[PDB]
Design a protein around this ligand. Structure first.
Ligand SMILES: [Mg+2]
Length: 273
């Protein structure tokens, strides 16, 4: 049973993704997050290697589970009559990147570089596992404050990665690319790189660059804080209007701005501790 295996704590958050609670695995006192999703709110279903019918979210989380700590780990899941329950890893202490940037303002380039590098490694892992996240943004990134490790969360709007066009999108509009706004069409990799440009701007400027549809399609990035010419170059390249003009993950990680990254433990000692 589920109520015997986990001590439930306070609500951490609710919205489009469902309702998430703090919790403890009674056996070993491991910190967990307990996510509830109503069967009515699930449009996308899949099958396990098992051949069992589950939310696409469970399929995608199982595909990315491994030693690699850059993606949130699914520990267990349960089917109830009207809902699924997901048991997820909970770092402690933790802060989400949205809240961290709200509290600290625009990050120093050395810290933005460390965080952005870790997000690139996590997104490479997803893509290597056949998973497209589709909602990369500061709210979906947790910081393990003691280890200086970032984790990607909320795979519930993701998809199997494919090389053909996507004509459905239920991620965050203001991190969505101009080809989605104009044509309701995108390709996975080039739409992910757009969302990474929005995230890097968010880190170095303290907020997202565009609010309205017309700004997204307009082809102009204004820098509201002091940002190095190399960092501006990378951001403007990720936010190229034409998807085929955007860098690959390899071209981002080889960019001159991305050189000499801090290790996670150095990031924690210098910036978080
Ligand atoms: Mg979602």
């Amino acid at each position: 049973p589920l109520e015997s295996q986990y001590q439930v704590g306070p609500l951490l958050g609710s919205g489009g993704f469902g309702s998430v609670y703090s919790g403890i695995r009674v056996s070993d006192n491991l910190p967990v997050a307990i996510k509830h999703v109503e069967k009515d709110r699930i449009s996308d279903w899949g099958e396990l290697p098992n051949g069992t019918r589950v939310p696409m979210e469970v399929v995608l989380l199982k595909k990315v589970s491994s030693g690699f700590s850059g993606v949130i780990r699914l520990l267990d899941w349960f089917e109830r009559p009207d809902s699924f329950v997901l048991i997820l890893e909970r770092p402690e202490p933790v802060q989400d990147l949205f809240d961290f940037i709200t509290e600290r303002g625009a990050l120093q380039e050395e810290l933005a570089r460390s965080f952005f590098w870790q997000v690139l490694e996590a997104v490479r892992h997803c893509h290597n596992c056949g998973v497209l996240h589709r909602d990369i943004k500061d709210e979906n990134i947790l910081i393990d404050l003691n280890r200086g490790e970032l984790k990607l969360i909320d795979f519930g709007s993701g998809a199997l990665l494919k090389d053909t066009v996507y004509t459905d999108f239920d991620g965050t509009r203001v991190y969505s690319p101009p080809e989605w706004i104009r044509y309701h069409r995108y390709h996975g990799r080039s739409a992910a790189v757009w969302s990474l440009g929005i995230l890097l701007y968010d880190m170095v400027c303290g907020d997202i660059p565009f609010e309205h549809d017309e700004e997204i399609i307009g082809g102009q990035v204004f820098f509201r804080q002091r940002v190095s010419s190399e960092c501006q170059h990378l951001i403007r390249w990720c936010l190229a209007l034409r998807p085929s003009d955007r860098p690959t993950f390899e071209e981002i990680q080889n960019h001159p701005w991305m050189q000499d990254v801090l290790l996670p433990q150095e990031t924690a000692e210098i910036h978080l501790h």
